[PDB]
């Protein structure tokens, strides 16, 4: 009679095998990275290959149904997620043409090639392509590295860019969807929720105010860099224009600390480095993980230590076999804790270790959710919760509580603003970079921009907001724009841009709800229990509900707000205003050294 029993029977049967295969497929990758042998490749690659073929059989009949005759809104959400088509309807013939673009593109970008004119002298393997661009303070050396890393690497990527786009236009019509642009915007879709739904049209207005209101601070940061380096490098800097692309340090430009010694915010006071004393005290490497853990118990959860401290290694390769120790902490499955990291005694790595195992605390709470809804509310929440406390526990004031700081420490405010500045600039470094990339892609799929403008339009949007210009114009044979991050590596950035605004939101949500008073930039959550009880409210909610409900419970806002951001750096903003009371905060994008 009722067709619901068919839906109920499918849901349980699919989950039981999938999570078993999810554990099995995962261990093949995790074991391979801990133990790299060719016999492990066979286990690793076959388990990936066999899982997908079985998955499709279950997913084909899974989406054979739809959101019909399901009065349960929660079950309807679970079904809605599994019913995504993707490549299920994609034909095999068009798939193959895509594989050629993908496999070649990644391999050819890693091998950077830079011509070394005049042959120099007898040369060894050294120096290396990565190293040469980072240490070069000479004008010719920096440009010589940069020109090769742009011109001679973009050439190989040009043939692969256009073929990938052509298929993007074609596959849309065979996948019952208009264009790829809706897919990325539909990631935050809420459907069939009265007085509570969220729409893709809303983000366009909200993101407009974020950049406009942050821009005055970024303009000061842009002016700050130029004014200080004007004294050291006046010849290679235009006071009435943009800045040469070679001065960013590297292709990415996310790291401004390479020339930190030439742009120290306060050189009058010597370097703040007081952790050397702790280095010779010979503390164990595993204590750092406990330091985060004992922080976590403060919010009144029990401890975790039995059966999840054996599957890991610290400080030692363990054999003549080599292990990659990139930071990759995933609970393999069914509560199996695992963390691979080269844990070393370092102030910077101290917060990193907090971040790494703090990822597990997220996973442990939501591990009870069924298979199809077991993850965080949005992409950027995960890394945010790890970072907010790691920065809080890495503050020198907290060092006093744990006794790490010197007993004779006198209250300093010069040190605080310097740390926040480097913390600020790294985050805001690439927001305008991804801003032009994310917005430019959307109108590409619309179809009002033809193929010819893939050179000028990419540069035009960048100059409007970012202000980066190549010193020498490059013709169409030369391929500068090809080095974008979504074709060169095809890694999603959506976990990064919207994360930062979520990070301020999570940072502000904890403090204001915990009766916190004083400075906004410093917040204390150790020795409190109210925050964690509210924390667990969505730390274990999961995706059984849209993220909108959790947003209203913790704070009470269903939209994204930027106003608190100005209060965060109130002491910092004063110093920036004081130093630039004479110069003009801004630049002319239209002026060029050529003309």
């Amino acid at each position: 009679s009722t067709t619901e029993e068919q839906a109920k029977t499918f849901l349980e049967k699919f989950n039981h095998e999938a999570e078993d295969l999810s554990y099995q497929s995962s261990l093949a990758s995790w074991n391979y990275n801990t133990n790299i042998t060719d016999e492990n490749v066979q286990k690793m690659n076959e388990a990936r290959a066999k899982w997908s073929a079985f998955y499709e059989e279950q997913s084909r009949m899974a989406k054979t149904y739809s959101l019909e005759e399901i009065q349960n809104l929660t079950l309807k959400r679970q079904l809605k997620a599994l019913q995504q088509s993707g490549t299920s309807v994609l034909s095999a013939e068009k798939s193959k043409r895509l594989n050629t673009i993908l496999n070649t593109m990644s391999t050819i970008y890693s091998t950077g090639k830079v011509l070394d004119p005049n042959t120099q002298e007898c040369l060894a393997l050294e120096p290396g392509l990565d190293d040469i661009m980072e240490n070069s303070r000479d004008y010719n050396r920096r440009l010589w590295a940069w020109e090769g890393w742009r011109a001679e690497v973009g050439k190989q990527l040009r043939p692969l860019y256009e073929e990938y786009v052509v298929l993007e236009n074609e596959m849309a019509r065979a996948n019952n969807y208009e264009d790829y642009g809706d897919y990325w915007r539909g990631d935050y879709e809420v459907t069939e929720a009265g007085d509570y739904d969220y729409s893709r049209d809303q983000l366009m207005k909200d993101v407009e105010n974020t950049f406009a209101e942050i821009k005055p601070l970024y303009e000061q940061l842009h002016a700050y860099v130029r004014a200080k380096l004007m004294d050291t490098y006046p010849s290679y800097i235009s006071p009435t224009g943009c800045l040469p692309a070679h001065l960013l340090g590297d292709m990415w430009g996310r790291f401004w600390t390479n020339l930190y010694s030439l742009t120290v915010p306060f050189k009058h006071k010597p370097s703040i480095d007081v952790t050397e004393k702790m280095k010779n005290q010979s503390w164990d490497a595993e204590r750092i993980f406990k330091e985060a853990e004992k922080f976590f118990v403060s919010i009144s959860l029990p401890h975790m230590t039995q059966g999840f401290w054996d599957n890991s290694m610290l400080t030692e390769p363990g054999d003549g076999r080599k292990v990659v120790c990139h930071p990759t902490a995933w609970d393999l499955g069914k509560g199996d804790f695992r963390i691979k990291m080269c844990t070393k005694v370092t102030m910077d790595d101290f917060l990193t270790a907090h971040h790494e195992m703090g990822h597990i605390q997220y996973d442990m709470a939501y591990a009870a959710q069924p298979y199809l809804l077991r993850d965080g509310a949005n992409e950027g929440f995960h890394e945010a919760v790890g970072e907010i406390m790691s920065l809080s526990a890495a503050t020198p004031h907290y060092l006093k509580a744990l006794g790490l700081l010197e007993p004779d420490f006198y209250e300093d405010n010069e040190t605080e603003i310097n740390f926040l500045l480097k913390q600020a600039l790294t985050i805001v470094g690439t927001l305008p970079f991804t801003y032009m990339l994310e917005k430019w892609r959307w109108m590409v799929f619309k179809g009002e921009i033809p193929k010819e403008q893939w050179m000028e339009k990419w540069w035009e949007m960048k100059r409007e907001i970012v202000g980066v210009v190549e010193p020498l114009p490059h013709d169409e044979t030369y391929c500068d724009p090809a080095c974008l991050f979504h074709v060169a590596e095809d890694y999603s950035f959506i976990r990064y841009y919207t994360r930062t605004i979520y990070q301020f939101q999570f940072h502000e949500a904890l403090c204001k709800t915990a009766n916190h008073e004083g400075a906004l930039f410093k917040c204390d959550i150790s020795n409190s229990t109210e925050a964690g009880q509210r924390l667990l409210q969505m730390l274990s909610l999961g995706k059984s509900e849209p993220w909108t409900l959790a947003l209203e419970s913790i704070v009470g806002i269903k939209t994204m707000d930027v106003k608190p951001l100005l209060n965060y750096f109130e002491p910092l903003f004063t110093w920036l205003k004081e130093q630039n009371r004479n110069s003009f905060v801004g630049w002319s994008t239209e002026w060029t050294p050529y003309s």
Binding site: E12, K13, H16, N311
Partner: protein
């Protein structure tokens, strides 16, 4: 009993029911070998739509979580009837 009832490659012997017609009467067993059906259209031997096999394996492993380790259970039930109480628990002190 994780240290003895768990196999590294897997313990697929242990099997538990997942689907049946209706609720069980207390103290009843369900060993009937029958494949569940929805609508009676699918027949035995061909299970492509709506037909599944309700007995799934626990698949115990030593690397699982505390709640995913096997925990043997022993249940005692006491019955008093019109019988002369043939089962009982009696300390006796030394005589003087």
């Amino acid at each position: 009993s994780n240290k003895l009832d768990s196999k590294v490659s897997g313990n697929y012997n242990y099997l538990y029911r997942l689907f049946r017609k209706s609720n069980l009467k207390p103290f009843e067993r369900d060993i009937s070998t029958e494949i569940y059906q929805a609508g009676n259209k699918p027949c035995n031997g061909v299970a492509g739509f709506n037909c599944y096999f309700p007995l799934r394996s626990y698949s115990f492993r030593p690397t699982y979580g505390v709640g995913h380790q096997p925990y043997r259970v022993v249940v005692l039930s006491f019955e008093l009837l019109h019988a002369p109480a043939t089962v009982c628990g009696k300390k006796s002190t030394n005589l003087v």
